[PDB]
Ligand binder design. Structure first.
Ligand SMILES: NC(=O)c1ccc[n+]([C@@H]2O[C@H](COP(=O)([O-])OP(=O)(O)OC[C@H]3O[C@@H](n4cnc5c(N)ncnc54)[C@H](OP(=O)(O)O)[C@@H]3O)[C@@H](O)[C@H]2O)c1
Ligand SMILES: NC(=O)c1ccc[n+]([C@@H]2O[C@H](COP(=O)([O-])OP(=O)(O)OC[C@H]3O[C@@H](n4cnc5c(N)ncnc54)[C@H](OP(=O)(O)O)[C@@H]3O)[C@@H](O)[C@H]2O)c1
Ligand SMILES: [Mg+2]
Ligand SMILES: [Mg+2]
Lengths: 428, 428
C-alpha cells in the first residue's frame, strides 16, 4: 500500500502498466488469444483481442499480471497439436501462458491465505480438490489434475488471469518481474524428478547424470544437485556451453557428439548390439573419469528419450533410478531387460509437480541458493515471436520470459512500473 | 534325535537314504556335476560323479539333501549359456541346483543360530556380508551378491551341498521332502516383486494383473494377492487352465490368444499404432469387466517382456508400478513415453529376493496360507531328464522337484526315509 493512491481512475479498460485503483476490476482487458480456425504457427494462431475479465469463484483469485513465462506448451496450443485445447474445454477462445508474476486483485469468498495487493508468482497445477488423492495421497494422481494455461484458457498472456488459491506462492522481492515469472514451471518439474520419488531422492554425496544441461530443465537439475550436496554431471552439444554449466555448480561435463551409441536398441546378440555396447561403455568411463572408478551415477535425469534411453539404462548404478518427463526425440523407448532387472534399476515417469513440491523449490530461489537463469525477455508485442523462437530451437540456454503490465525490462517494484509509465497495448 | 541310533556305521561313502550317524561326514558323496567340455543339453552335460564332500568355513553349513527343486537356471548352466559358470568361478566342476530340503550335518565355528540335526530348506541368495548394502541397506544391491547353485557349484544336486548360514530357513513339518524343496526360489522372487518395492506394495483391495498365471511364478502371484486381500487377475493361454488358477484365489481370468496387440511398439502415429491401441483397449475393458469400470490395476506383474510390455505399460493405473524379473520372449523392451510420464507410472526391475524377504514368504506357507503347488517329482536318476522337460516347455503348471536322499515320493520325516530303505545311487 505504498502506492495505493498514485494510481489511475476507475474505468473499464486500462492500457499496459496503467495501474487501476487496488481492487477495482475493469469490465475488459487486453489479451493474446487463440481460436480453433487460427490453429497453426504461433505468429499465425496467437492474435490480439479485447475480452472480458474472468469471473471467479469461492476459492479462486484474480491476478494483475506484470510478466509471464514462455514455455513449449504455449506452442502446442497455438498449434492444436498433439491436441487442440478446445477438445479439452468447452471454450470459444483460449488464453495461454503457464508461468507468471503479479498482484492479487480480487479473491473469492472463501480465500483467507492470500489478500488483495499481495505480490505473487504462479504454479501451473490444478485439481478439483475433493477426491482421495487430493486429500491424503499425491494430488498428481487425481484424474481431476490439469495444467493451467494449457488445458485451461484462463492463462497468463493477458492483463488478468484466473487461478486457484492452491496455485499461489510468494514472490522473491529480490528479482525483477520477469525473473520472478520464468522459472516456476520448469523448476518445480525438475524438483519433483529429484525429490518426489522416494526412496530414490537426491542426497549429499550422490552423482547425477543431467541430460541437456543448458536446457530450461538442465540448468535446474545442475543447480539443485549442487545446492544439496550432490554432484551434477552435465551433458551438452556445444563446447562454448561448457563454462556456463560449470559456473552453475556442475562437477564435470561431457559432450554427446563424440559418440555414436545413439538411436534405438539394436536387436540383441547382433554385432551392432556388440558395437553399440562398445562405445556406450566409453561413455561410461567418461563418467568415472569425473566420478572416480566403480562409481556409477545414483540417478539419470532424462528427457530426450528414444535416442538415449538405451544408454541411460546402462550407466545407472544398481539400485538407481532413471526418471524422465518427456521424449523430445521420439517415444519408441527401448532397453535391454537384462540390465534393469539384474541390477534392479527403477525407471520412473514424472510429470510437473504439486504445490508442496513447487514451493519447496521456490524456497531455494528465495534463499538465493538457486537462480532463475532467465535467457532473455521479449515485450508484450513479441509474445508470438518469442514462441516461434522456441518452436525451431533457436533460443539461448535457460528460460525465456515476456512482459505484460510491466512496461520495461529491469523493473522490480510496482512503484517502478508506475514512474516508467503506461504503455499502449494495441499499437501498429 | 528320535532316530539317532537307527542309523548306519561310520564310513566314507553312503548310498541314497543310507543315513550316516548324525554329524559324521564321509570323505565322499554322489553328485550330478557339469564340466566345461560337456556343455550342451541337460542329458548331455549333467553326468554322474563321485566327488569329495565340501570343505566349510566359519559361517557356513553343510546339509544332507533329501529333495531339491528344478529351475530354469540349472539348464542355462548345463548349456553354458547365456554364460558358462566356469567364467564366474575358478572351479574344475560344477554342482547345480538352487532349491532344497534336508538336515544340517555340520556347522562352522561361528554358527549359533542353527544346530546339527535341524530340518531346513534353502534360499539361494549369498553375499560376502561386509559392505554398506549388506549392513544397512538392501543386500541385493551389493556387487558381492550371487545365486547359489548357478554362480556357485556347491549346489543341491548331490548328497551334500554347502551354504551360508544366512541362506537357511526352517522347514514346514506338514510337507513332504519334495514339497518343502520346490518353491522357495520362485516364491521368494514373486514376494520381492509385490512387497519389496515401497511404496508400490500390495494392499487389501488392490487389483493386480498377473501374467502367465499357471507358471511357477504365476501361481505365487495369484496366491499371495488373495492371501493378503488383493484381487489377482490371471492371464493364461489354455482354457483347461481356467479352473486351476481360479481355485487358487484368482478373482477373474483372461486369455491372451483372443487378441493381437502382441509384439514390439509400432512406430508412433502410424496406423498400426492406431490399430494396436484399438485391441489393447479391448484387453483393458476385459479387466474392468472383472474389476468394475474406471478401475485400472494397481500393479502389473510382468516377466514375458518384449511381446507384452507395450501393453502392460498401458493398462496400469496412474501412480501404478509394472515390476518384472525376466523377458522370456525377448529383451528389446518398448513403450510409449507419453503414457508413463503423464500418468507417472513406475517401471521397476526386480531380481530374486533376500533372506528377510524369502522368509516372510516362507511364513505364508508355514501357516498353510499358501501352497507350494508342486507340479511333479522325478527320482534321482531322472534329474537331467527333469531339466530337459523344462527346456522345451512341456512341463505341467507349477513347480517341479527331484529326489535325492529321500528314497521315494511321499516321504515326510527322516524316520520315513529309513524304513523305506537305502537306494543305489549309481545303477545302470
Ligand atoms: N511434461 C512435463 O512435465 C514437462 C515440463 C517441462 C518441460 N518438459 C519438456 O522437457 C523438454 C525440455 O525442456 P527444456 O526447458 O530443457 O527445453 P530446452 O531448453 O529446449 O531443452 C533442450 C535442451 O535439451 C538438450 N538436448 C536436445 N536434444 C538433445 C539430444 N538429442 N541429446 C542430448 N541433449 C539434447 C539441449 O542441450 P545440449 O544439446 O547442450 O545437450 C538443450 O539445451 C521439452 O520436451 C519440454 O516439453 C516437460
Ligand atoms: N531372474 C530372476 O530373478 C528369476 C527368478 C525366477 C524365475 N525367473 C524367470 O521367470 C520366467 C518364468 O518363470 P516360471 O516359474 O513361471 O516358469 P514357467 O512355469 O515356465 O512360466 C511360464 C508361464 O508363463 C506363461 N507364458 C509363457 N509365454 C507367455 C507369453 N508369450 N505371454 C503370456 N504368458 C506367457 C505361461 O502361462 P500361460 O501361457 O497360461 O499364460 C506359462 O505358464 C523365466 O524366465 C524364469 O527364468 C526369473
Ligand atoms: Mg520457461
Ligand atoms: Mg521350481
Amino acid at each position: 500500500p505504498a502506492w495505493t493512491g498514485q494510481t489511475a481512475e476507475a474505468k473499464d479498460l486500462y492500457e499496459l502498466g496503467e495501474i487501476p485503483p487496488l481492487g477495482h476490476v475493469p469490465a475488459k482487458m487486453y489479451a493474446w488469444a487463440i481460436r480453433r480456425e487460427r490453429h497453426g504457427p504461433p505468429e499465425q494462431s496467437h492474435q490480439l483481442e479485447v475480452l472480458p475479465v474472468w469471473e471467479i469463484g469461492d476459492d479462486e483469485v484474480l491476478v494483475y499480471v506484470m510478466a509471464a513465462g514462455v514455455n513449449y506448451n504455449g506452442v502446442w496450443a497455438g498449434l492444436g497439436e498433439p491436441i487442440s485445447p478446445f477438445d479439452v474445454h468447452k471454450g470459444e477462445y483460449h488464453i495461454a501462458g503457464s508461468d507468471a508474476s503479479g498482484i492479487v486483485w480480487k479473491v473469492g469468498a472463501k480465500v483467507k491465505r492470500w489478500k488483495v495487493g499481495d505480490e505473487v508468482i504462479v504454479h501451473c497445477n490444478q485439481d478439483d480438490g475433493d477426491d482421495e488423492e487430493c486429500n491424503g495421497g499425491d494430488p498428481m494422481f487425481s484424474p481431476t489434475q490439469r495444467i493451467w494455461g494449457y488445458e485451461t484458457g484462463d492463462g497468463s498472456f493477458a492483463q488478468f488471469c484466473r487461478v486457484q488459491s492452491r496455485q499461489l506462492m510468494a514472490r522473491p522481492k529480490h528479482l525483477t518481474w520477469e525473473e520472478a515469472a520464468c522459472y516456476t514451471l520448469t523448476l518445480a518439474t525438475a524438483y519433483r524428478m529429484l525429490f518426489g520419488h522416494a526412496p530414490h531422492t537426491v542426497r549429499p554425496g550422490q552423482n547425477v547424470l543431467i541430460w541437456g544441461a543448458s536446457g530450461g530443465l538442465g540448468v535446474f537439475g545442475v543447480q539443485l544437485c549442487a545446492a544439496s550436496g550432490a554432484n551434477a554431471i552435465a551433458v551438452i552439444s556445444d563446447e562454448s556451453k561448457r563454462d556456463y554449466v560449470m559456473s552453475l555448480g556442475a562437477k564435470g561435463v561431457i559432450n554427446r557428439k563424440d559418440f555414436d551409441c545413439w538411436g534405438q536398441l539394436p536387436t540383441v546378440n547382433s554385432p551392432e548390439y556388440n558395437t553399440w555396447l562398445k562405445e556406450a561403455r566409453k561413455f561410461g568411463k567418461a563418467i568415472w573419469d569425473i566420478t572416480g572408478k566403480g562409481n556409477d551415477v545414483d540417478i539419470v535425469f532424462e528427457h530426450p528419450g528414444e535416442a538415449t534411453f538405451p544408454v541411460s539404462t546402462l550407466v545407472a548404478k544398481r539400485g538407481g533410478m532413471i526418471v524422465f518427463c518427456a521424449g523430445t526425440t521420439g517415444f519408441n523407448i527401448t532397453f535391454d531387460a537384462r540390465y534393469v532387472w539384474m541390477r534392479q534399476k527403477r525407471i520412473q515417469g514424472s510429470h510437473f509437480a504439486h504445490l508442496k513440491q513447487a514451493s519447496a523449490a521456490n524456497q531455494f530461489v528465495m534463499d538465493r541458493r538457486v537462480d532463475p537463469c532467465m535467457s532473455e525477455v521479449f515485450p508484450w508485442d513479441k509474445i508470438p515471436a518469442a514462441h516461434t523462437k522456441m518452436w525451431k530451437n533457436q533460443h539461448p540456454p535457460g528460460n525465456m520470459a515476456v512482459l505484460v503490465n510491466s512496461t520495461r525490462a529491469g523493473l522490480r517494484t510496482v512503484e517502478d512500473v508506475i514512474e516508467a509509465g503506461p504503455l499502449k497495448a494495441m499499437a501498429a
